[PDB]
């Protein structure tokens, strides 16, 4: 009975029960972690057996972090984390470091564990029970439920907040120059001071925190070549939004002039002050694509005038802290991808394009779910809410993998969409 | 405005053991890509890799020798220390130390070098 | 044990000219050379990092290249230092290892 401090009350919203939801093959490798980290925090008993009574479930499965080479266990719980919000968003919400975004370096601590001392709502565990698979159906599944508070949560660091905003009062005083987020399972830190200076200042925030039970993952760093672990930090300054912009021939065939319309069409609907009549007008009977129609100086006037409109931050885009989020992810070429983020249609907040990592093994699927999350991570850090996301892939070819190459505490929200190249808008180039 | 000096015994006496001495300012051992690399060089040859000993000592040996090497760090002192067990003739040579460094996730060399000892086998 | 291997030994040429020395590895070293100056006297410094990057301070006149297996250091036109012992240095694994050397002296 881990701790004498009470427990905290929750409510799933009216008229919705439990999450009950089944369990994805899963493969031994992973099953095999899964069992382990699942017996040891059994015996600590912060999970508990138990059987078919329980008429709810959840997925869970593991990855083995790529940066500290530890398997991590990793409980799906989106639809439970639905269920449940009058809670953790209205009620009590963790506020969100205007200027977190405003730095030059910033790093992410994993603190999971530091839930597992506080115990969880009675009446409430029954909704956060999983399963666990055996390769060829040996046994049948060992399912178990929370008693403290869950990894992966949205009420966890809600609940938490009370003791973890404690925690950090003396760092907070002792270092003010310093910001510190929490976003679910993740501490997000960041500095102005040399980056050598920042690892530092992190490291022994890593201490502080040993200074409290809270155990922090133990990141690697390698010695030989790929020097992976350079990248931990975050930097919210190449981070730079990506405009769209209108090509520049010398002379423009029939069929580059009307693509070149469609785009600055299609633009027209972001950016209003977009004229295409004395544009089009050079394409006035059914004529031969492939035709070298010459620019006329009534038109060029506007070409490269719209143009001039594509570089300037967008029509009084403002973010409403009370709406979802949503991105979309346009499978550009070799290697390249681009999003877009906006809570109203057409009224991007942000618009980029993640470029690639040298070792995305020419795997879309990998590079794809790279781009999520690294898409993810600057939502949580510039807004700190995630993302609805409409992938261009099909469902049932990333559910197969997606798992794979997945390494986050969180998991956001997405759907499949099939939408081909609607203007090469999304610009390539 | 960093420097490396190796300190030393010149000359030791066969199967005995020599610690060699790297005293460096500008830099700390602390700091995270950073390390001390010992180099070797004997008499006509060429440049030898010896050991590293990073901050976080996640130290790195030459397998030829490991059998007969160490190495420390006073970190407060800025001082970096190597020691060869049971040496012969064929340890005769001259001893660099160098301030190897990780700047980014490609970039690892040895940035800075001292000027070397002169460790020399003989009865 | 990633053996380096700098063929050319003993080179000689002269001032104003250019020159191209060889690192061949042992195996795809992705780039992970380093290429080191040691003067007659015996100072030993860093040229150039990563196959083509050249350390702060270095003379423009000096170019890294390599792929591979192969790689090539080239001296733009000679000055009268230059004309030095050269080697250079792998670090794509454990233990780190370093060429043959090739010392560049003086035609007369």
């Known amino acids: 009975p881990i701790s004498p401090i009470e427990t905290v009350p929750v409510k799933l919203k009216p008229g919705m029960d439990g999450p009950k939801v089944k369990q994805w093959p899963l493969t031994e490798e992973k099953i095999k972690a899964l069992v382990e980290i699942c017996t040891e925090m059994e015996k600590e008993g912060k999970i508990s057996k138990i059987g078919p009574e329980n008429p709810y479930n959840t997925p869970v499965f593991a990855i083995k972090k790529k940066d500290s080479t530890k398997w991590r266990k990793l409980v799906d719980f989106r639809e439970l984390n639905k269920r449940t919000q009058d809670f953790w968003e209205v009620q009590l919400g963790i506020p969100h470091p205007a200027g977190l975004k405003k730095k030059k370096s910033v790093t992410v601590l994993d603190v999971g564990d530091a839930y597992f001392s506080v115990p969880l709502d009675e009446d409430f565990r029954k909704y956060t029970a999983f399963t666990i698979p055996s390769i060829n159906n040996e046994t049948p599944g060992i399912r178990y439920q929370y008693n403290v508070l869950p990894q992966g949560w949205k009420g966890s660091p809600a609940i938490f907040q009370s003791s973890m905003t404690k925690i950090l009062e003396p760092f907070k005083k002792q270092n003010p120059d310093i910001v510190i987020y929490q976003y679910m399972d993740d501490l997000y830190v960041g500095s102005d001071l040399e980056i050598g200076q920042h690892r530092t200042k992190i490291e022994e925030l890593r201490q502080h925190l040993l200074r409290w039970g809270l155990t922090t993952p133990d990141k690697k760093h390698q010695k030989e070549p790929p020097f992976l672990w350079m990248g931990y930090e975050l930097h919210p300054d190449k981070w730079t939004v990506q405009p769209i912009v209108l090509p520049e021939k010398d002379s423009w065939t029939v069929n580059d002039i009307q693509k070149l319309v469609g785009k600055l069409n299609w633009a027209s609907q972001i950016y209003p002050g977009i004229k295409v009549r004395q544009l089009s007008k050079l394409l006035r009977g059914t004529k031969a694509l492939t035709e070298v129609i010459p620019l006329t100086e009534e038109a060029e006037l506007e070409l490269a005038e719209n143009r001039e409109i594509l570089k300037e931050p967008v029509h009084g885009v403002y973010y409403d802290p009370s709406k979802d989020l949503i991105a979309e992810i346009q499978k550009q070429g070799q290697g390249q991808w681009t999003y877009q983020i906006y809570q109203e249609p057409f009224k991007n907040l942000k618009t980029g394009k993640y470029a690639r990592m040298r070792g995305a093994h020419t795997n879309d699927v990998k590079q794809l779910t790279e781009a999520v999350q690294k898409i993810t991570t600057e939502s949580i850090v510039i807004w700190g809410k995630t993302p609805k996301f409409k992938l261009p892939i099909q469902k049932e070819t990333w559910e197969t993998w997606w798992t794979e190459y997945w390494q986050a505490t969180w998991i956001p929200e997405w759907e499949f969409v099939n939408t081909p190249p609607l203007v090469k808008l999304w610009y390539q180039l | 405005q960093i420097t490396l000096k190796e300190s030393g015994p010149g000359i030791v006496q066969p199967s005995q053991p020599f610690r060699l001495t790297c005293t460096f300012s500008g830099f700390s051992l602390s700091t995270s890509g950073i390390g001390v690399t010992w180099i070797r060089q004997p008499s006509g040859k060429g440049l030898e890799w010896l050991a590293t000993?990073?901050?976080?000592?996640?130290?790195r040996y030459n397998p030829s020798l490991k059998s007969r090497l160490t190495v420390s760090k006073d970190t407060s002192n800025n001082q970096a220390f190597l020691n060869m067990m049971t040496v012969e003739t064929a340890d005769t040579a001259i001893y660099y130390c160098?301030?190897?460094?990780?700047?980014?996730?490609?970039?690892?060399?040895?940035?800075?070098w001292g000027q070397g000892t002169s460790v020399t086998v003989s009865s | 044990d990633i053996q380096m291997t700098q063929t050319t030994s003993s080179l000689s040429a002269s001032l104003g000219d250019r020159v191209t020395i060889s690192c061949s590895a042992s195996?795809?070293?992705?780039?992970?050379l380093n290429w080191y100056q040691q003067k007659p006297e015996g100072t030993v410094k860093l040229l150039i990092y990563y196959t083509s990057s050249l350390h702060s301070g270095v003379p423009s006149r000096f170019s890294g290249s390599g792929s591979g297996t192969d790689y090539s250091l080239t001296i733009s036109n000679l000055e009268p230092e230059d004309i030095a012992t050269y080697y250079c240095?792998?670090?794509?694994?454990?233990?780190?290892?370093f060429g043959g050397g090739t010392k560049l002296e003086i035609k007369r």
């Open positions: 195996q795809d070293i992705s780039s992970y």
């Open positions: 160098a301030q190897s460094a990780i700047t980014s996730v490609t970039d690892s060399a040895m940035d800075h």
């Open positions: 000993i990073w901050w976080d000592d996640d130290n």
């Open positions: 240095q792998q670090y794509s694994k454990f233990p780190w290892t």
